[PDB]
Every structure is written in structure tokens, then in C-alpha cells.
Amino acid sequence: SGNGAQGTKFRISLGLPVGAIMNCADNSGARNLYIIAVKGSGSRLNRLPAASLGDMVMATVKKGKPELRKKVMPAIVVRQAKSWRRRDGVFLYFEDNAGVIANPKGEMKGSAITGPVGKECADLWPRVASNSGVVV
């Protein structure tokens, strides 16, 4: 979360520890995203930092345009798979893990988002909302 995240976010089961690869879900040129860090996360001997829906990770692009490969950049998680429970009572999960590459401000590199998008992310990152089709 953090910068350009106007809003707080209720907890959600961490689903993507460092090393997880998620689908890149925008039109930026990138096809996948490899998580190397989770922003806002904390310490514990041996614990992997892990992201959830609406989190900002640091990633690299394992597959995609070469202009996008070989460098670390920010991205936002938009779908999970690990189910999680909202305060309205429901356990829900998506069919894939996926994110969209973004700047520290939280603005999106690309211009569209392919797929549904979790509300908790939409709610958290205005630009992610703009470019979403179906939310949740």
C-alpha cells in the first residue's frame, strides 16, 4: 500500500509470497510479474513477505517486451486465488493471480486492464478503478 493509496485497507489473507509470479493484466507489454518485495510489510525471522489484493509489490517482468525486462518496478495486485474473507461474511477467490505495473504514486503504466478486478483494490487505487472493466 502506502503512497497514493488514499484509503486504509482491511486485512486479507496473504496469498503471494516473494517469488510468486502473477499474470500481468494490463496492456503495458509485460506478460507476467515476479514479486520481489511487498511494500508496507514487516519483519520476522524466516517469514516471506507476502502480498495480497490491493498491495503494492516491487516486481520484475520475467516475460514480456525487452524494454520492460531486467529492472525492478512497482506493481499492484489485482486478483488473488488464495481465498479470503470480507467483512460481509464471504470467502471468495479468483482463478488467477494478477497485477498491473505502476509508478510509486500508484499510477498505471498501461491503459487498460484485462480481467475482473477485486473491489478492495479498486477502492484503494483510483487509476486502477478507471481502467477496470468488471469489479469483483
Binding site: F91, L92, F94
Partner: protein, 98 residues
């Protein structure tokens, strides 16, 4: 509060209960319990699983008195005439003959 229904079985899903699955095409599938959730994930077909609503609807199981008649009809009969013509000379010239 809204009771929901099982995409696979059509059981009622009371709040916080079973799971919700959002598929690639943003189609949303709701399960009441992991039984329906598994048969769904197993590409099983509800119309072939004998304990499901869908199966039962299809095989016409125990609908009985829904196909039984009803008593729903009206009993009106009233004039109004025609707007602009004097609705007073529309019942005195409405005396018929046959």
C-alpha cells in the same frame, strides 16, 4: 441480507457460507459447500447429478400441485365512452336492438 443460491446445486446459501468463485470471464459462481464446489471444479454436469434442483427440474421430480389448476381472473364490465364526445349521449344511443 440476501439468501443466495448455489450455481451448481441451487441450494440456498445463507450469509457467510460456502465459497464464491470469480472466473476468468468475470462470471461469478457461488457454492454452498465444498461438495458442489468439487463437482463443479470436476466439470461435472448438474443435470446428471441426481440430487440437484437442476437435475430435478429437468427430470420433472415431484412438482405435483404446481401443474394443478388455479383461481385467478377478473370481473369488470364498465363504460367510460370516448374523450371529447359527450359521454351523456353514449348510453341513450347505447340501447341496442339486438
Amino acid at each position: 441480507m440476501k439468501v443466495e443460491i448455489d450455481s451448481f446445486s441451487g441450494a440456498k446459501i445463507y450469509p457467510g457460507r460456502g465459497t464464491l468463485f470469480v472466473r476468468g470471464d468475470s462470471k461469478i459462481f457461488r457454492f454452498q459447500n465444498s461438495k458442489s464446489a468439487s463437482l463443479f471444479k470436476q466439470r461435472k454436469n448438474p443435470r446428471r447429478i441426481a440430487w440437484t434442483v437442476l437435475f430435478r427440474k429437468h427430470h420433472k421430480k415431484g412438482i405435483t400441485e404446481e401443474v394443478a389448476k388455479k383461481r385467478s381472473r377478473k370481473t369488470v364490465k364498465a363504460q367510460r365512452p370516448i374523450t371529447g364526445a359527450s359521454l351523456d349521449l353514449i348510453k341513450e344511443r347505447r340501447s341496442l336492438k339486438p
